[model samples]
Target: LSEQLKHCNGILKELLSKKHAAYAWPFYKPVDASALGVHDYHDIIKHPMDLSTVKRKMENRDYRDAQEFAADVRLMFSNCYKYNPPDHDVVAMARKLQDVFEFRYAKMPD
Candidate 1:
């Protein structure tokens, strides 16, 4: 359990850092909807992360094991990938992040 917690924390920290970095520089600049293949800025808007819900789950220690926690992480990022604009850099980054989770928990059943 300790090792799992440590690993989960490390991965979460890296994911958060990546998100922060994405918002810090060139990645954060305004995008032209047309170039992104989106019809308008409104089309790019996605549902915000439900941090409160996630926090509640974490506080309750709802996860049964490291695998469960990893699945939660994958699902969160997968949803982000689903909502991301097609053919955009953000989508690429999200996919890469999702891949990290997939690689880490590859043994688990899909």
Candidate 2:
């Protein structure tokens, strides 16, 4: 169990690091409004460190088993939803992470 936890944590860290890179800059272009003389528009930006809170939470918690770790993973994503509802990409990434966690760590029922 301990070994599995270590490996799972390592994988999750890498996964989240990649996700952070992708979502660090949430920007989108404005619609085509040249006809209205509004062609110039700045992109929408969001804080890159949003997921860092989840990383810190993961680091702080001590898991007794895969189930416990899985619960924390879900909670982290849920909080992400709460804070970053506008980031659809981040939410998709969270879903992917959830699938990965379930595949790697979720134990079968006894």
Candidate number achieving the greatest lDDT relative to the actual structure:
1
Name the best candidate (by TM-score): 1
Local distance difference test, each candidate: 0.53, 0.51
Tens-place lDDT per residue, model 1, 1-110, is 35665565555555546554553222222344577676744454443232234344555777556776666665555555666667767667666766665565554433
Q: Write the per-residue lDDT of candidate 2 for residues 36-63, one digit (tens) a residue.
A: 3533321322222233443554577656
Candidate 1 weakest lDDT stretch, 10 residues = 23-32
User: Distance (Å) between predicted and true CA of 52, model 1?
Assistant: 7.6
User: TM-score for all predictions?
Assistant: 0.50, 0.45
Reference-based TM-score, model 1: 0.50
